Amino acid sequence: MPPYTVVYFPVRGRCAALRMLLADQGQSWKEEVVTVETWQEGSLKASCLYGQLPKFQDGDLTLYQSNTILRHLGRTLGLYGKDQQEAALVDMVNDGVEDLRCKYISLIYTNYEAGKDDYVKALPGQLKPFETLLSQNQGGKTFIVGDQISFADYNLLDLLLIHEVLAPGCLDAFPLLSAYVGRLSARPKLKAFLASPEYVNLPINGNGKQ
Amino acid sequence: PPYTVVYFPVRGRCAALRMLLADQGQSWKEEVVTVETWQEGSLKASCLYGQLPKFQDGDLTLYQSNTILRHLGRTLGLYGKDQQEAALVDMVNDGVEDLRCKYISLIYTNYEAGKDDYVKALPGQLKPFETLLSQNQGGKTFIVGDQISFADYNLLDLLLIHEVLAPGCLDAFPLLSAYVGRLSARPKLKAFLASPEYVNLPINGNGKQ
Ligand SMILES: N[C@@H](CCC(=O)N[C@@H](CS[As](SC[C@H](NC(=O)CC[C@H](N)C(=O)O)C(=O)NCC(=O)O)c1ccccc1)C(=O)NCC(=O)O)C(=O)O
Ligand SMILES: N[C@@H](CCC(=O)N[C@@H](CS[As](SC[C@H](NC(=O)CC[C@H](N)C(=O)O)C(=O)NCC(=O)O)c1ccccc1)C(=O)NCC(=O)O)C(=O)O
Ligand SMILES: [Ca+2]
Ligand SMILES: [Ca+2]
Numbered sequence: 183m184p185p186y187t188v189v190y191f192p193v194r195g196r197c198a199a200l201r202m203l204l205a206d207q208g209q210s211w212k213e214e215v216v217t218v219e220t221w222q223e224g225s226l227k228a229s230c231l232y233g234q235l236p237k238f239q240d241g242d243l244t245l246y247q248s249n250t251i252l253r254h255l256g257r258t259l260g261l262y263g264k265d266q267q268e269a270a271l272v273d274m275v276n277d278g279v280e281d282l283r284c285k286y287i288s289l290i291y292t293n294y295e296a297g298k299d300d301y302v303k304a305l306p307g308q309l310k311p312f313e314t315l316l317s318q319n320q321g322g323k324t325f326i327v328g329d330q331i332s333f334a335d336y337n338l339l340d341l342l343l344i345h346e347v348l349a350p351g352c353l354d355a356f357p358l359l360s361a362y363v364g365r366l367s368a369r370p371k372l373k374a375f376l377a378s379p380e381y382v383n384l385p386i387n388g389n390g391k392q
Numbered sequence: 393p394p395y396t397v398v399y400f401p402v403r404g405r406c407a408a409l410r411m412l413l414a415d416q417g418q419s420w421k422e423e424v425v426t427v428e429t430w431q432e433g434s435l436k437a438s439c440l441y442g443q444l445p446k447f448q449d450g451d452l453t454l455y456q457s458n459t460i461l462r463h464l465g466r467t468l469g470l471y472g473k474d475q476q477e478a479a480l481v482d483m484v485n486d487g488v489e490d491l492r493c494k495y496i497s498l499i500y501t502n503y504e505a506g507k508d509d510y511v512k513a514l515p516g517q518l519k520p521f522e523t524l525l526s527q528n529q530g531g532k533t534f535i536v537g538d539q540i541s542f543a544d545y546n547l548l549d550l551l552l553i554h555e556v557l558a559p560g561c562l563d564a565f566p567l568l569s570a571y572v573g574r575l576s577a578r579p580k581l582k583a584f585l586a587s588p589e590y591v592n593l594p595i596n597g598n599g600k601q
Contacts, residue, residue, distance in 0.1 A: 231520050232487050245479055247486035254479040270454055270463040277456035278441055284493070311440050 186211035189237035191218070193388045194381070196248035196283075197236050199340040200255060203333060205375035207259050213380075218388075249280060249337075256333035264328055271327045275315060275334040279341050282308050286344065294391050302349045306356075309345070312338060313356040322358030331366075339366050347392050395420035396448035400427065403595045405457035405492075406445050407553075408546040409464065414584035415545070416468055422589075427597075458489060458546075465542035472537050480536040484524065484543040488550050491517050495553065503600050511558045518554070521547060522565040531567030540575075548575050556601050 186204065190197045192215050204211050216226060216235060227233055231246045238244070238251045240258075245251055256262040256272070263269040285308070289301050316322035326335050342363050345352055353360040367373060375381055386392045395413065399406045401424050413420050425435060425444060436442050440455045447453070447460045449467075454460050465471040465481070472478045494517070498510050525531035534540050535547055551572050554561050562569045576582060584590055595601045 231483070231523070232490065233516075243476060243479065245483055247483050247490075250479060250482040250486050253482050254475070257475050257478060266463075266466055267452055269466060270452065270459060273459040273462050274440070274454055274456050277459050281441065307442075314440070 184210040184212050185241055187214055187239040188212070189214045189216060189239070190235050191216055191221070191388060192384055194340075194344075194384050194386050195388065198344075198381075198386075199333075199337040200236075200238075200248065200251050201381070202340060202372060202375060203252065203255055203259075203261070203336040206331075206336070206369055206372040207255075207261075208371055209259070249276065252276070252333040252337060261330075261332045263332060264330065268328045268332075272332045272334045275312075275326050275332075276337055278311060279334065279337045283337075283341055286341075286348070290387050290391050291389060298348075302352070305345065305349055305352055309342075309352065309356055309359065312342075313359050316358040316362060322362065326362075335366060339363065343367075344386055344392070347386065393418065393449065396423055397421070398423045398425060398446040398448075399444045400425055400430070400597060401593060402597045403549075403553075403590070403593050404597065407590075407595075408542075408549040409445075409447075409457065409460050410590070411549060411581055411584060412461070412464055412468075412470070412542060412545040415540075415578055415581040416464075416470070417580060418468075458485065461485070461542040461546060470539075470541045472541055473539065477537045477541075481541045481543045484521075484535050484541075485546055487520060488543065488546045492546075492550055495550075495557070499596050499600050500598060507557075511561075514554065514558055514561055515564060518551075518561065518565060518568065521551075522568050525567035525571060531571065535571075544575060548572065553595050553601070556595065 186209065188197055188201065188211055190213075194201075201211075221227060230237060234246065236248055236251065237246055238254075240254070245254060253262070253276075263272045285301070289297050312326070313322075315326055319325070319327065320329065325331050326338055339362075342353065342359060346363075353363065367376060395418065397406055397410070397420055399422075403410075430436060439446055443455065445457055445460065446455055447463075449463065452463075454463060462471070462485075472481045494510070498506050521535070522531075524535055528534070528536065529538070534544050536543060548571075551562065551568060555572075562572065576585060
């Protein structure tokens with residue numbers, strides 16, 4: 183059997199980036215799907231460390247927390263910078279991505295109708311830092327940190343993709359981010375994954391909003 | 393090194409990294425930024441995400457409180473003994489961060505109407521850290537493994553600010569209670585926690601705690 187298992191709801195959500203990472207690195211994994219019905223039964227939830235999914239298994243190592251999973255795969259597959267300084271910058275990018283992801287999640291699940299206009303107005307100022315990081319790394323022609331891909335690239339890519347669904351054209355203001363999405367999305371194993379039913383037939387979020 | 397911490401005159405998201413630096417015998421410079429200096433706009437515009445803390449380690453400039461914690465963890469060997477422990481350290485820290493975000497939302501956004509619900513939910517929010525202790529050498533050492541990690545300083549801070557918010561919140565948790573006592577008694581950390589530089593700073597920026 184595969185050494186990796188992803189336990190999650192039938193949504194892209196906080197597993198999208200880590201799935202992209204695994205597919206792009208040609209790793210095999212099992213998807214264990216938890217229905218809302220099963221979740222409401224309560225036993226699985228009670229057994230989860232923080233009462234939430236995703237849960238991830240790497241052999242007998244059981245992890246919770248989407249960013250913990252990303253960092254763990256980053257470490258074990260060599261997607262965490264070439265040295266200690268690049269590692270810090272990778273973290274800095276990922277923490278920025280997480281901060282914006284949390285704002286996105288708050289919009290989607292708690293305030294979509296009343297909040298979308300303001301959110302979209304504020305969006306360029308929230309995306310700009312990633313454009314700046316790109317502009318300061320080899321003119322934005324490679325990755326978000328250094329000259330090799332990192333877990334932060336996959337997470338940032340996911341963040342950009344869902345924001346283009348939320349606010350079509352939002353990357354027209356950001357030439358380097360725009361080209362970056364194109365480039366990464368064209369990586370053959372990733373392109374194939376992103377076009378596959380496994381990805382395409384899951385909704386982005388759990389409540390029908392995007 | 394040497395290190396510079398750039399932040400507002402509060403404990404906030406720098407408290408844990410300060411505890412770490414002091415406990416580890418490191419020296420650093422505090423650059424205090426006043427609310428007045430921030431409102432001018434220039435420093436803020438130079439910050440990657442328009443926010444503090446900002447941190448300098450020689451020629452390296454970092455933003456993001458957990459990035460700074462992880463960098464110190466990595467460079468000072470406070471990140472577990474191997475990749476497996478490193479993942480566990482991250483898992484703890486990410487749990488600490490989630491609860492810290494809820495705390496921050498309460499304090500700054502909804503203190504008066506939200507505190508009652510927050511406090512009632514608190515035991516179930518703290519229990520995971522007691523369980524983690526229970527599963528690691530009977531709770532007698534650190535949150536992960538046999539050596540201190542950056543996640544211990546972050547968890548310690550989280551627990552200390554929660555005992556201010558809800559006195560007695562650790563009483564039902566013997567391992568966490570004992571852990572806070574043990575860590576707080578480490579000599580350099582004890583000295584730091586007793587010092588004016590810690591005690592005379594407010595926890596948060598808005599008078600609430
Ligand atoms: N008391 C809960 C409130 C309920 C809640 O979970 N709200 C969500 C948006 S619902 As979605 S993602 C599934 C969710 N897992 C996480 O939030 C993990 C966060 C962690 N930091 C990480 O990065 O891994 C979950 O497990 N919910 C179940 C539960 O808590 O009972 C969804 C909905 C329906 C079907 C499929 C998927 C929220 O706002 N989360 C915050 C965030 O994701 O940043 C509480 O305390 O949050
Ligand atoms: N819409 C704004 C809201 C403004 C805001 O910052 N709210 C705070 C609570 S105020 As405090 S802590 C200083 C703060 N830095 C961060 O939030 C960094 C987050 C990062 N993930 C990390 O971990 O480092 C900041 O720089 N604020 C200034 C600014 O943004 O211009 C304080 C107040 C007064 C005096 C001293 C200290 C908030 O809710 N932050 C989120 C969090 O900490 O999780 C927005 O976009 O945030
Ligand atoms: Ca000074
Ligand atoms: Ca050590």
